[PDB]
């Protein structure tokens, strides 16, 4: 019955194994960090991931989301800016549906929903700058009411930003 909080800045740790680097000799610590814990939380997804993020430029988090899409996880992404090789651009090129705001600041959430059961939500924008340098919190909660209410909010915004 998961209820955790990750505080940032993250310790810089190796994530090559975790992110299936193609093909450890590197010089980083090979222990867990706030980033590695966030990556693992995302990578435990077996069926769906909703992402509702003001900003998303972290290549480590971008890669994890790609890996999920490749695994057949149903990935849906809402961001504030259209970004138009950013991460949103790379995700979009891989076939992941991304919908978006007016890049005016209005879509300011920073949350993700894993398999309609775990809520990941924080102050943290998903950028290497913020991860490595800012004081931030991210909550990881397996809570049915919070998941339900955040899912409902997602689906309203999703339908609202429908292109067609």
26 interacts with, out of Zn ion, a second copy, none, CB within 5 to 8 A per kind: Zn ion
Any contact of residue 26 with Zn ion (CB under 5 A)? yes
Question: From CA 57, how far away is CA 89, in angstroms rounded?
Answer: 10
Judged on CB neighbours under 10 Å (0-12, 13-18, 19+), 158 is middle
Residue 83 lies near a second copy (rule: CB under 8 A)? no
**Total of residues contacting Zn ion (CB under 5 A):** 3
Question: Closer to a second copy at the Cβ: 3 or 93?
Answer: 3
Give bridge partners of residue 52 from the DSSP assignment: 78, 111
User: Closest distance between a second copy and the C-beta of residue 143, in Å?
Assistant: 7
Please tell me which residue in 115, 116, 117, 143 is annotated as part of the active site: 115
For residue 123, give every residue at least 6 positions away whose Cβ sits within 8 Å of its Cβ, in sequence order, or none.
110, 136, 137, 138
Binding a second copy (rule: CB under 8 A), the pick from 14, 134, 142, 158 is: 134
Residue numbers annotated as active site = 108, 110, 115
């Amino acid at each position: 019955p998961r209820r955790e909080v990750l505080f940032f800045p993250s310790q810089v740790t190796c994530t090559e194994a975790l992110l299936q680097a193609p093909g450890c000799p590197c010089s980083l610590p090979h222990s867990e960090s706030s980033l590695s814990r966030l990556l693992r939380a995302l990578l435990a997804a077996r069926s769906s991931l909703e992402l509702c993020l003001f900003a998303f430029s972290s290549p480590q988090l971008g890669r994890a989301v790609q890996l999920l899409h490749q695994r057949g996880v149903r990935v849906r992404v809402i961001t504030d800016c259209d970004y138009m090789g950013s991460q949103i651009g790379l995700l979009r090129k891989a076939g992941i549906q991304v919908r978006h705001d007016q890049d005016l600041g209005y879509m300011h959430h920073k949350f993700a929903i894993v398999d309609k059961k775990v809520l990941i939500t924080g102050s943290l924008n998903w950028t290497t700058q913020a991860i490595q340098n800012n004081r931030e919190n991210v909550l990881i909660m397996e809570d049915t009411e919070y998941v339900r209410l955040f899912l409902e909010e997602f689906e309203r915004i999703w339908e609202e930003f429908d292109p067609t």
